[PDB]
Design a protein around this ligand. Structure first.
Ligand SMILES: Cc1ccc(O)cc1-n1c(=O)c2c(c3c(N)ncnc31)CCCC2
Length: 275
């Protein structure tokens, strides 16, 4: 852990409030005083009292992964507290929380260009992640955090590995073939989530039907008022043949173009799912 994460002094951390319930203990918001004396807002994951040796390793395991990344679209690790209790992971604070819950509060309230900006940030973060040889395996709108300026950043490195059915590519579901191309599939689902303002992918379909339908060639339908360019990008991310999916670099380039001329987004697009 300490190879990649600074040990922070607990005297430099203030706890303001409990803000959520994580897998391993509550999440708080607070402040961190840096060595330069600058004070920043932080999010603080705590490890529950009475944790096992195993829970502690898996908890801190995420920090070991997060700490290897330094990118504007990947949640920044400020450090860990292990020498006192509770054990903590301290990250940059993201005022607007998880992207799916944020978008659900604002159905149809953002411009296409604003949504594209969010999507471009996520793609850029994933381009960096894939460049470092990590497959996220849990790329979903609920695992993207969004700040006060609407910048989106990849979070939740709990399932991440060095090289969730609704978000997983067919081949990864079929035989655990996880590659950066399976993350690209997940990115296509996130793209659908964003353009749908946080609608649940495949709604409440039974998992075996999600698995069978996607395998048969069915895809999520275009969200209401979705630009053709963005729906096509979803379909490209969802190619059955993983070698035909775009790379994250190409996705970033595609979105950089749509951001560049919103007069591209003017063309708008028997079963729920489409064949
Ligand atoms: C604190 C934290 C550490 C690691 C990680 O993967 C995610 C988080 N984290 C979080 O787990 C959460 C939030 C959050 C936030 N608002 N800002 C920064 N990190 C955060 C707010 C929503 C509730 C969960």
């Amino acid at each position: 852990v300490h190879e990649f994460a600074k040990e922070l002094d607990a005297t430099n951390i203030s706890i303001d409030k409990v803000v959520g319930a994580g897998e391993f203990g509550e999440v708080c918001s607070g402040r961190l005083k840096l060595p330069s004396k600058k004070e920043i807002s932080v999010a603080i994951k705590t490890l529950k009292v009475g944790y096992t040796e195993k829970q502690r390793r898996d908890f801190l395991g995420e920090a070991s992964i997060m700490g290897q990344f330094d990118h504007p679209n990947i949640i920044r690790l400020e450090g860990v507290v292990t020498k006192s209790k509770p054990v903590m992971i301290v990250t940059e604070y993201m005022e607007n929380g998880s992207l799916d819950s944020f978008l659900r509060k604002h159905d149809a309230q953002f411009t296409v260009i604003q949504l594209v900006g969010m999507l471009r940030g996520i793609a850029s973060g994933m381009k960096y992640l894939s460049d470092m040889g990590y497959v996220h395996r849990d790329l979903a709108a609920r695992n993207i955090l969004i700040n006060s300026n609407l910048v989106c950043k990849v979070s939740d490195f709990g399932l991440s590995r060095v090289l969730p059915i609704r978000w997983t590519s067919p081949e990864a579901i079929a035989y655990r073939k996880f590659t950066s191309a399976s993350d690209v599939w997940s990115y296509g689902i996130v793209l659908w989530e964003v353009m749908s303002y946080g609608e649940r992918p495949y709604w409440e379909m039974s998992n075996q039907d999600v698995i069978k339908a996607v395998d048969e060639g069915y895809r999520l339908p275009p969200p209401m008022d979705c630009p053709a360019a963005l729906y096509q990008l979803m379909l490209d991310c969802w190619q059955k043949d993983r070698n035909n999916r775009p790379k994250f670099e190409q996705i970033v380039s595609i979105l950089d173009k749509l951001i560049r001329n919103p007069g591209s987004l003017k063309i708008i697009t028997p079963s729920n799912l489409l064949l």
